[PDB]
Design a binder for these strands. Structure first.
Lengths: 114, 49, 48, 49, 48, 322
RNA sequence: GCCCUUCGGGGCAUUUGGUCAAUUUGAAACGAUACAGAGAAGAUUAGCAUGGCCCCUGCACUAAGGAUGACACGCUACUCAAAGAGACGC
RNA sequence: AAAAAAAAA
């Protein structure tokens, strides 16, 4: 059947109706605009090269901060030392762009599907 | 109005008014067509033909 | 700007296959079993 | 009289609003009559006030 | 509240229902259908 | 025209952290932090120097397709594919206003630079002009026959220029809410617009063609040619740098006056991304212009910096006059 | 009608309002009647949308419902040819 | 301390 259909021509916006007002639609709320006070920044433009210098100084400061520069009881046991290198996970937390193979999905699906 | 830059619709409307000997109507249509769509070779060919 | 000079190679390069669904058939069509099994890559997968 | 005029303007005369403000159908309603008659919270809250 | 409600009731009574004036929000019963609407529009724009 | 020498741009920092494509990007006037809205329905506030995540804000139920931090007010505006345009009070980190009325998903959002007006563009094919204070839709700029994919506000006529996916670009007189001109030079959907900050010119980008125009006449000034991809974005510096980012992942840095492409790149995708997932979805220079923040379909914010090592001789202008 | 006057005169107050009450011929409607038989390629079926010269209930013109509210299911030349070979062709 | 949810000559 073709009762159930896609959209190939989505609905188009209309201008407002130029009619007499009787209907109530939007109750007033937050009718006062806040402005950036002195100290809240924004209302001060200095130049371009000063901004570039400040940006590069902040980047150099962050890189400086990151760098830091100013009978034995276990002898009949069949297998010994099976857990070397297992605790070494956590060298650097790494992002994989696959939500089916990310570590979050594996943790989630091992927690829940028991 | 719904399809302004459609060449098939333009040719259909021109030919529909040419089959009924409305020559002045069809020449107005062809001027409007090659004004609307100046880089469509089919409309220009149809007007010269 | 003046229209792009296409070739028949380009027209063939932009042919969209007719879609044969493995699930859906809203017109109740009878499709040949060759074409139904055309996009099933499972038979053409590798085993080793 | 206001609620009575509203009821009669909507052509719902098969609902009697009595003088103690009870709205009752005067007859057995069809499905379309029931669907058209269901009033709102504004009408009913005003009627109980 | 009640004068607002009665004014809107009388607005429907005397100037009619505006059936599709303002856009309905994407409530929870419309989430997946809306995602489909937007997804299909986006894929079509990339192909066109 | 002899082009100027511009240093080439290289990848500085890669910031993972969204779970959907980064479609929006907006820098504070004070250049301290920037705002990435993404397909994981969220707006993240990141510090610009360190790159660290400061905050995550969730108010949208669809992908965030637009952001703006107001230079006069302590507000941040957003729009999304959920038909919603919101005003966030950054003194509380909470949504305080709604701008309702778009019939379907909203693709772009700009603020008028001088006066307190918000213009948004949408897949209902229309650009709605809103008042910030009263949330009232003062104008419904209509006449496009397709999705309004990008939009710029300007301090003088034409105050609103909208580019749509039906390939036309309309310039709108804001006082009357009616168009003063249509530019039909583009063959396919005009996804990007940008305005030069010091010259009274602008640029529109469709697939393969980036055309540069003059205000208010809409006079065809020149044509950036060579980027044969779907152009999603456009970013001009103060030092005449046009950035064409392209949905296949292609990056082109042009000189604004001459049209000379002084750099061409392909961006790199994260570990795990498909080759289909290589593509630039958003871009903006910061307020200084020293950095270019791009957001890509491998769910990644990338920062691009100028190479200080390169000289005018190590990368000479290979421009051949005709 | 009052008030002033030098008895000649003058003053205060100033234009309301929707064919009339008049039920056929200026426009209200269901019921009721004969009926009817609730969508998704066998059967039974939960829905959520889409577009608007289709609406109804509702404060909701930023809910929800009305069979998933219904409508949808029809029609179908027209940007239009090219080579090759045949004909008690003409 | 209502709706779903009881059908178009």
């Amino acid at each position: 059947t073709t009762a159930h259909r896609p959209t190939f021509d989505p609905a188009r916006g209309k201008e407002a109706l130029r009619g007499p007002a009787y209907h109530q639609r939007l109750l007033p709320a937050y009718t006062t605009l806040k402005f950036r006070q002195p100290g809240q920044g924004g209302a001060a433009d200095k130049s371009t090269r000063d901004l570039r210098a400040e940006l590069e100084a902040a980047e150099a400061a962050h890189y400086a901060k990151l760098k830091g520069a100013p009978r034995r009881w276990d002898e009949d046991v069949v297998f010994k030392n099976q857990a070397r290198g297992t605790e070494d996970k956590g060298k650097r937390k790494e992002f994989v762009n696959d939500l089916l193979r990310s570590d979050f999905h594996k943790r989630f699906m091992s927690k829940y599907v028991r | 109005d719904v399809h302004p830059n459609n060449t098939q619709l333009w040719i259909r409307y021109i030919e529909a008014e040419l089959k009924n000997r409305n020559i002045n109507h069809a020449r107005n249509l062809l001027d409007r067509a090659v004004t609307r769509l100046p880089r469509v070779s089919k409309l220009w060919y149809k007007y010269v033909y | 700007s003046p229209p792009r000079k296409l070739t028949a190679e380009d027209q063939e390069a932009w042919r969209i296959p007719p879609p044969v669904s493995m699930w859906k058939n809203p017109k109740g069509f009878t499709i040949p079993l060759d074409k139904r099994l055309a996009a099933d890559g499972r038979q053409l997968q590798e085993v080793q | 009289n206001m609620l009575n005029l509203l009821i009669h303007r909507k052509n719902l005369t098969y609902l009697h609003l009595d003088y103690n403000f009870n709205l009752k159908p005067v007859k057995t309603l069809t499905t379309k009559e029931r669907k058209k008659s269901r009033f709102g919270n504004a009408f009913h809250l005003m009627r109980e006030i | 509240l009640l004068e607002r409600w009665l004014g809107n009731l009388l607005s429907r009574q005397f100037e009619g229902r505006h059936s599709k004036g303002v856009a309905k929000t994407v409530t929870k019963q419309r989430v997946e259908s809306h995602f489909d609407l937007e997804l299909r529009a986006s894929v079509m724009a990339d192909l066109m | 025209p002899r082009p100027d020498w511009h240093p080439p741009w290289k990848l500085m920092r890669v910031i993972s952290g969204h779970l959907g494509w980064v479609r929006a990007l907006a820098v504070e006037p004070n250049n301290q932090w920037f705002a990435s809205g993404a397909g994981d329905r969220t707006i993240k506030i990141w510090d610009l120097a360190s790159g660290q995540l400061r905050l995550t804000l969730t108010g949208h139920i669809s992908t965030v397709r637009g952001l703006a931090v107001s230079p006069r007010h302590p507000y941040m505006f957003s729009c999304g594919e959920d038909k919603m345009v919101k005003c966030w009070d950054l003194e509380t980190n909470k949504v305080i206003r709604h701008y309702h009325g778009h019939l379907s998903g909203v693709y772009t959002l700009k603020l008028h630079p001088t006066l307190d007006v918000l213009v948004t563009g949408g897949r209902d094919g229309v650009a709605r002009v809103w008042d910030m204070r009263t949330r009232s839709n003062v104008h419904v700029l209509s006449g496009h026959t397709g999705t309004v994919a990008d939009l710029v506000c300007q301090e003088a006529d034409p105050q609103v220029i909208t580019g749509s996916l039906d390939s036309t670009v309309r310039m709108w007189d804001l006082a009357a809410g009616k168009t003063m001109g249509v530019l039909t030079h583009h063959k396919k959907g005009v996804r990007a617009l940008v305005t030069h900050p010091t010259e009274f010119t602008f640029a529109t980008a469709s697939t393969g063609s980036i055309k540069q125009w003059k205000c208010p006449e809409g006079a065809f000034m020149q044509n950036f040619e060579g980027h044969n991809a779907i152009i999603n974005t456009l970013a001009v510096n103060d030092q005449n740098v046009l950035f064409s980012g392209g949905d296949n992942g292609s990056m082109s840095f042009w000189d604004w006056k001459s049209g000379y492409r002084f750099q061409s790149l392909d961006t790199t995708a994260q570990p795990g991304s498909l080759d289909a997932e290589l593509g630039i979805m958003s871009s903006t220079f910061d307020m200084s212009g020293a950095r270019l923040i791009t957001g890509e379909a491998d769910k990644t914010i990338k920062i691009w910096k100028e190479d200080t090592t390169a000289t005018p001789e190590t990368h000479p202008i290979e421009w051949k006059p005709s």
